[PDB]
Design a protein around this ligand. Sequence first.
Ligand SMILES: O=N[O-]
Ligand SMILES: O=N[O-]
Length: 152
Amino acid sequence: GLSDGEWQQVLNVWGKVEADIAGHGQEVLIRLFTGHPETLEKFDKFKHLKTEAEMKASEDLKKHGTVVLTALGGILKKKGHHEAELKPLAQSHATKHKIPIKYLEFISDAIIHVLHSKHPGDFGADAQGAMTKALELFRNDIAAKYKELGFQ
Ligand SMILES: O=N[O-]
Ligand SMILES: O=N[O-]
């Protein structure tokens, strides 16, 4: 688990994200897709985006970033008590979207990069550690559901 002080750091920086969830969402997915191009292949609706300029010009990419981070926000605010969210999210990501755990790691790393890039004053090393733990917790619980399913 995280401590109370770690949860508070996580949700304090998350409050900054919420000022422009859509801009954050866009930068997170651009960082993901450019850093790890295999991840883009999982999204039929984004495979036509070749260049970073195309990704940045895509309103649908921006929309999807908003949807992803808003879902992630909901999870974070449960402070680990996220069984109701995490069961169906694991089931869709394992079964419908065929998303390896490693890609969850990649997007967590993209989030940490973007939050550090935009909020260094609320995202010093300790707060970065706490966000990395919160994202590790969610990934770790999703992994158990992947294992249950035999994916793969
Ligand atoms: O669409 N999940 O990023
Ligand atoms: O990031 N506020 O310095």
